[PDB]
Write a protein that holds these residues in place. Sequence first.
Motif, mmCIF file in Angstrom:
data_model
loop_
_atom_site.group_PDB
_atom_site.id
_atom_site.type_symbol
_atom_site.label_atom_id
_atom_site.label_comp_id
_atom_site.label_asym_id
_atom_site.label_seq_id
_atom_site.Cartn_x
_atom_site.Cartn_y
_atom_site.Cartn_z
ATOM 1 N N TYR A 129 0.776 -1.138 -0.060
ATOM 2 C CA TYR A 129 -0.058 0.100 -0.107
ATOM 3 C C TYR A 129 0.799 1.340 0.039
ATOM 4 O O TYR A 129 2.069 1.252 0.398
ATOM 5 C CB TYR A 129 -0.717 0.203 1.264
ATOM 6 N N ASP A 130 0.331 2.475 -0.300
ATOM 7 C CA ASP A 130 1.047 3.588 -0.106
ATOM 8 C C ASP A 130 1.149 3.888 1.205
ATOM 9 O O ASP A 130 0.009 3.608 2.031
ATOM 10 C CB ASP A 130 0.228 4.772 -0.931
ATOM 11 N N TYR A 131 1.988 4.514 1.992
ATOM 12 C CA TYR A 131 2.004 5.050 3.225
ATOM 13 C C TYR A 131 2.830 6.369 3.187
ATOM 14 O O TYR A 131 3.767 6.451 2.389
ATOM 15 C CB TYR A 131 2.980 4.253 3.870
ATOM 16 N N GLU A 132 2.081 7.449 3.729
ATOM 17 C CA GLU A 132 2.523 8.730 3.716
ATOM 18 C C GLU A 132 3.226 9.212 5.163
ATOM 19 O O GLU A 132 2.716 8.883 6.338
ATOM 20 C CB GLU A 132 1.558 9.630 3.610
ATOM 21 N N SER A 141 8.112 7.405 3.591
ATOM 22 C CA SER A 141 6.972 7.276 2.706
ATOM 23 C C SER A 141 7.422 6.343 1.594
ATOM 24 O O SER A 141 8.607 6.081 1.183
ATOM 25 C CB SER A 141 6.584 8.573 1.973
ATOM 26 N N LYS A 177 5.304 4.296 -2.178
ATOM 27 C CA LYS A 177 4.138 3.959 -2.978
ATOM 28 C C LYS A 177 4.079 2.549 -3.075
ATOM 29 O O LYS A 177 4.928 1.649 -2.916
ATOM 30 C CB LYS A 177 4.195 4.804 -4.245
ATOM 31 N N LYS A 178 2.782 2.135 -3.453
ATOM 32 C CA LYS A 178 2.464 0.829 -3.597
ATOM 33 C C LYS A 178 3.259 0.209 -4.675
ATOM 34 O O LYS A 178 3.624 0.729 -5.733
ATOM 35 C CB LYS A 178 1.009 0.177 -3.784
ATOM 36 N N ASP A 180 6.624 -0.162 -4.650
ATOM 37 C CA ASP A 180 8.251 -0.034 -4.065
ATOM 38 C C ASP A 180 8.912 -1.018 -3.574
ATOM 39 O O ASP A 180 8.138 -1.876 -2.843
ATOM 40 C CB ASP A 180 8.183 1.379 -3.212
ATOM 41 N N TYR A 196 2.567 -3.555 5.826
ATOM 42 C CA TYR A 196 2.354 -2.743 4.861
ATOM 43 C C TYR A 196 2.938 -3.428 3.550
ATOM 44 O O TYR A 196 3.044 -2.899 2.460
ATOM 45 C CB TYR A 196 2.621 -1.272 4.803
#
Lengths: 57, 57
Positions: free
Chosen positions: A7-10, A18, A20-21, A23, B53
């Motif tokens: 998932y994306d994580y900020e 951070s 992005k899905k 990565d 994640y």
Amino acid sequence: TTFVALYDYESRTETDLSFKKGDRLQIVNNTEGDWWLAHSLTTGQTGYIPSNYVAPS
Amino acid sequence: TTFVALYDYESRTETDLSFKKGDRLQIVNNTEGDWWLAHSLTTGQTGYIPSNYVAPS
């Protein structure tokens, strides 16, 4: 060993990463160990701790 | 299950927990899972990630 973001994580602080899905990430050996969310029975405070700093009672 | 601090730790951010040696701590279930220090192969950035994640390649 290489992980992939599901998932994306900020980043919410100055210490998280951070991503992005999709990565690709590599885990980094640190002295502190994995970090755990913990509640202090002694002080009533709560937050993340370095797991290598604690032990089962 | 209750842990005991082996060392003092001073909080360095707004999200970690300070504790003194001997304090008693309880781990708290969180969605995010344990947090790992990770290096991004995609961006070259580095920092802590929530382990739930990501997945092995």
